[PDB]
Design a protein around this motif. Structure first.
Motif, PDB file in Angstrom:
ATOM      1  N   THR A  46       0.827  -1.204   0.000  1.00 20.34           N
ATOM      2  CA  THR A  46       0.000   0.000   0.000  1.00 20.34           C
ATOM      3  C   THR A  46       0.862   1.255   0.000  1.00 20.34           C
ATOM      4  O   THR A  46       0.591   2.201  -0.748  1.00 20.34           O
ATOM      5  N   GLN A  47       1.922   1.265   0.816  1.00 17.10           N
ATOM      6  CA  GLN A  47       2.796   2.430   0.910  1.00 17.10           C
ATOM      7  C   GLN A  47       3.509   2.700  -0.406  1.00 17.10           C
ATOM      8  O   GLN A  47       3.610   3.853  -0.844  1.00 17.10           O
ATOM      9  N   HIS A  48       4.012   1.646  -1.049  1.00 17.00           N
ATOM     10  CA  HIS A  48       4.734   1.814  -2.302  1.00 17.00           C
ATOM     11  C   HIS A  48       3.800   2.271  -3.414  1.00 17.00           C
ATOM     12  O   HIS A  48       4.199   3.047  -4.291  1.00 17.00           O
ATOM     13  N   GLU A  49       2.554   1.794  -3.395  1.00 16.28           N
ATOM     14  CA  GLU A  49       1.546   2.320  -4.308  1.00 16.28           C
ATOM     15  C   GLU A  49       1.223   3.775  -3.986  1.00 16.28           C
ATOM     16  O   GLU A  49       1.039   4.591  -4.897  1.00 16.28           O
ATOM     17  N   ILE A  50       1.148   4.114  -2.695  1.00 17.39           N
ATOM     18  CA  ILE A  50       0.958   5.506  -2.290  1.00 17.39           C
ATOM     19  C   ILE A  50       2.145   6.351  -2.730  1.00 17.39           C
ATOM     20  O   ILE A  50       1.980   7.429  -3.314  1.00 17.39           O
ATOM     21  N   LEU A  51       3.360   5.853  -2.480  1.00 21.54           N
ATOM     22  CA  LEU A  51       4.571   6.607  -2.788  1.00 21.54           C
ATOM     23  C   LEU A  51       4.722   6.837  -4.286  1.00 21.54           C
ATOM     24  O   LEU A  51       5.227   7.881  -4.711  1.00 21.54           O
ATOM     25  N   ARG A  52       4.286   5.872  -5.098  1.00 21.29           N
ATOM     26  CA  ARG A  52       4.342   6.038  -6.547  1.00 21.29           C
ATOM     27  C   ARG A  52       3.377   7.119  -7.018  1.00 21.29           C
ATOM     28  O   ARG A  52       3.747   7.994  -7.808  1.00 21.29           O
ATOM     29  N   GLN A  53       2.129   7.070  -6.543  1.00 18.97           N
ATOM     30  CA  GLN A  53       1.135   8.066  -6.938  1.00 18.97           C
ATOM     31  C   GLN A  53       1.498   9.451  -6.424  1.00 18.97           C
ATOM     32  O   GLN A  53       1.270  10.453  -7.111  1.00 18.97           O
ATOM     33  N   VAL A  54       2.039   9.523  -5.207  1.00 22.78           N
ATOM     34  CA  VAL A  54       2.520  10.789  -4.663  1.00 22.78           C
ATOM     35  C   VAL A  54       3.673  11.329  -5.504  1.00 22.78           C
ATOM     36  O   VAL A  54       3.725  12.527  -5.812  1.00 22.78           O
ATOM     37  N   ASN A  55       4.595  10.454  -5.911  1.00 27.15           N
ATOM     38  CA  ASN A  55       5.711  10.886  -6.748  1.00 27.15           C
ATOM     39  C   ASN A  55       5.237  11.344  -8.123  1.00 27.15           C
ATOM     40  O   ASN A  55       5.740  12.341  -8.655  1.00 27.15           O
ATOM     41  N   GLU A  56       4.274  10.631  -8.714  1.00 33.08           N
ATOM     42  CA  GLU A  56       3.722  11.057  -9.998  1.00 33.08           C
ATOM     43  C   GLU A  56       2.920  12.342  -9.856  1.00 33.08           C
ATOM     44  O   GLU A  56       2.876  13.160 -10.782  1.00 33.08           O
ATOM     45  N   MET A  57       2.256  12.522  -8.713  1.00 36.87           N
ATOM     46  CA  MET A  57       1.600  13.792  -8.435  1.00 36.87           C
ATOM     47  C   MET A  57       2.613  14.922  -8.330  1.00 36.87           C
ATOM     48  O   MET A  57       2.387  16.015  -8.860  1.00 36.87           O
ATOM     49  N   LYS A  58       3.735  14.671  -7.648  1.00 35.84           N
ATOM     50  CA  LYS A  58       4.743  15.706  -7.423  1.00 35.84           C
ATOM     51  C   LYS A  58       5.375  16.158  -8.730  1.00 35.84           C
ATOM     52  O   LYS A  58       5.641  17.351  -8.918  1.00 35.84           O
ATOM     53  N   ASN A  59       5.630  15.215  -9.639  1.00 37.44           N
ATOM     54  CA  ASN A  59       6.084  15.575 -10.976  1.00 37.44           C
ATOM     55  C   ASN A  59       5.010  16.356 -11.719  1.00 37.44           C
ATOM     56  O   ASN A  59       5.307  17.328 -12.423  1.00 37.44           O
ATOM     57  N   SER A  60       3.751  15.943 -11.569  1.00 39.49           N
ATOM     58  CA  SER A  60       2.651  16.681 -12.171  1.00 39.49           C
ATOM     59  C   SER A  60       2.396  18.000 -11.449  1.00 39.49           C
ATOM     60  O   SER A  60       1.961  18.971 -12.075  1.00 39.49           O
ATOM     61  N   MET A  61       2.645  18.048 -10.135  1.00 37.10           N
ATOM     62  CA  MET A  61       2.530  19.306  -9.399  1.00 37.10           C
ATOM     63  C   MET A  61       3.581  20.311  -9.851  1.00 37.10           C
ATOM     64  O   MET A  61       3.277  21.496 -10.029  1.00 37.10           O
ATOM     65  N   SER A  62       4.823  19.853 -10.033  1.00 38.58           N
ATOM     66  CA  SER A  62       5.887  20.740 -10.489  1.00 38.58           C
ATOM     67  C   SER A  62       5.625  21.226 -11.908  1.00 38.58           C
ATOM     68  O   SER A  62       6.056  22.322 -12.287  1.00 38.58           O
ATOM     69  N   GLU A  63       4.933  20.415 -12.712  1.00 40.34           N
ATOM     70  CA  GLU A  63       4.419  20.894 -13.989  1.00 40.34           C
ATOM     71  C   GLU A  63       3.412  22.017 -13.777  1.00 40.34           C
ATOM     72  O   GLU A  63       3.440  23.035 -14.477  1.00 40.34           O
ATOM     73  N   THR A  64       2.521  21.852 -12.797  1.00 41.08           N
ATOM     74  CA  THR A  64       1.488  22.854 -12.555  1.00 41.08           C
ATOM     75  C   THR A  64       2.075  24.108 -11.915  1.00 41.08           C
ATOM     76  O   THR A  64       1.584  25.219 -12.145  1.00 41.08           O
ATOM     77  N   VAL A  65       3.117  23.945 -11.095  1.00 42.96           N
ATOM     78  CA  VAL A  65       3.793  25.093 -10.494  1.00 42.96           C
ATOM     79  C   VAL A  65       4.470  25.936 -11.568  1.00 42.96           C
ATOM     80  O   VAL A  65       4.346  27.168 -11.591  1.00 42.96           O
ATOM     81  N   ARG A  66       5.177  25.277 -12.490  1.00 39.34           N
ATOM     82  CA  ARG A  66       5.955  25.991 -13.497  1.00 39.34           C
ATOM     83  C   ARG A  66       5.062  26.701 -14.509  1.00 39.34           C
ATOM     84  O   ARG A  66       5.381  27.808 -14.960  1.00 39.34           O
ATOM     85  N   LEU A  67       3.938  26.084 -14.874  1.00 38.66           N
ATOM     86  CA  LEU A  67       3.141  26.591 -15.988  1.00 38.66           C
ATOM     87  C   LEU A  67       2.374  27.857 -15.612  1.00 38.66           C
ATOM     88  O   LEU A  67       2.315  28.808 -16.399  1.00 38.66           O
ATOM     89  N   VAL A  68       1.778  27.891 -14.417  1.00 38.66           N
ATOM     90  CA  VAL A  68       1.035  29.083 -14.013  1.00 38.66           C
ATOM     91  C   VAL A  68       1.999  30.229 -13.713  1.00 38.66           C
ATOM     92  O   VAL A  68       1.629  31.408 -13.797  1.00 38.66           O
ATOM     93  N   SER A  69       3.258  29.907 -13.405  1.00 37.05           N
ATOM     94  CA  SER A  69       4.303  30.909 -13.240  1.00 37.05           C
ATOM     95  C   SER A  69       4.678  31.612 -14.539  1.00 37.05           C
ATOM     96  O   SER A  69       5.376  32.628 -14.476  1.00 37.05           O
TER      97      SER A  69
END
Lengths: 52, 52
Positions: A29-52
């Motif tokens: 469960t944790q590794h599945e959580i950690l993967r989705q969190v990591n993919e979110m973080k890469n997608s979050m950094s996409e969202t951080v950069r673009l609105v900037s």
């Protein structure tokens, strides 16, 4: 022997042992959580950069 | 003596015995989750602020 067997039937003398299956469910469960969190973080950094 | 010897070093449940190494991996993966949880939430408020 039954006194030992009731405390030695896989589960210890106390009832409700931590099962390796639930612990592996915990591990998976944790590794599945950690993967989705990591993919979110890469997608979050996409969202951080673009609105900037 | 044989029964105590077999049941003293891992009780025969055909389910696995819990090791501290797995519980440490439970600690390590989840702290890595929580580390990435905090990192995203910092970048989340950045996404909140940039969109706002």
């Amino acid at each position: 022997t039954e006194e030992i067997s009731k405390r030695g039937a896989g589960m210890p003398g106390q009832h409700g042992q931590i099962t390796q299956q639930e612990l592996d469910t915990v591990v998976k469960t944790q590794h599945e959580i950690l993967r989705q969190v990591n993919e979110m973080k890469n997608s979050m950094s996409e969202t951080v950069r673009l609105v900037s």
